[PDB]
Curated annotation (Swiss-Prot):
It comes from the Bacteria. Binds to the pentamer sequences ATTGG and CCAAT with highest affinity in single-stranded DNA, and also to other sequences. Has greater affinity for ATTGG than CCAAT. Can act as transcriptional activator of cold shock genes by recognizing putative ATTGG-box elements present in promoter regions of genes induced under cold shock conditions. One of its GO terms (biological process) is regulation of gene expression. Pfam families: CSD. Disruption phenotype: A double cshB-cspB disruption mutant cannot be made. The keyword DNA-binding applies. Residues 4-63 form the CSD domain. This is Cold shock protein CspB. The gene is cspB. Its main location: cytoplasm. It is found in: Cytoplasm, Nucleoid.
Amino acid sequence: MLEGKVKWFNSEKGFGFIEVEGQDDVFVHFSAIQGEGFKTLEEGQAVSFEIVEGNRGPQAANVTKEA
């Protein structure tokens, strides 16, 4: 398990991208990266997830809000 740190969020445009040291940008979406209730997230959004490796590169899948 590891943590990711937004590079910028586009929840409104359909998604937000995460960026983590030692890894690449973790794709983020209010469906898996969601959190307590359907809320929006701004820069600084720290989340917890497990990046895996799929055709378009590594990516988080069942991410969540850091605490």
